[PDB]
Amino acid sequence: SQEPMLDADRLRSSWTFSESMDLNYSNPSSSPNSLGNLKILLDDKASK
Amino acid sequence: KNTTSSSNENPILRWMSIKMNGFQNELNELSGHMISKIIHSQRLILQ
* Cβ separation A32–B47 shorter than 8 A: no
Q: Please check whether residue A7 is in contact with residue A13, taking contact to mean a CB–CB distance below 8 angstroms.
A: yes
Helices (H) then strands (E): counts for chain B:
1, 0
Resolution to 1 decimal place, in Å: 15.0
Residues of A in contact with B46 (CB under 8 A): 34, 36
CA trace torsion A43, A45, A46, A47 (10° rounding): 100
Q: What are phi and psi of B32, to 5 degrees?
A: -65, -65
- Is the distance from CB of B10 to CB of B4 less than 8 angstroms? yes
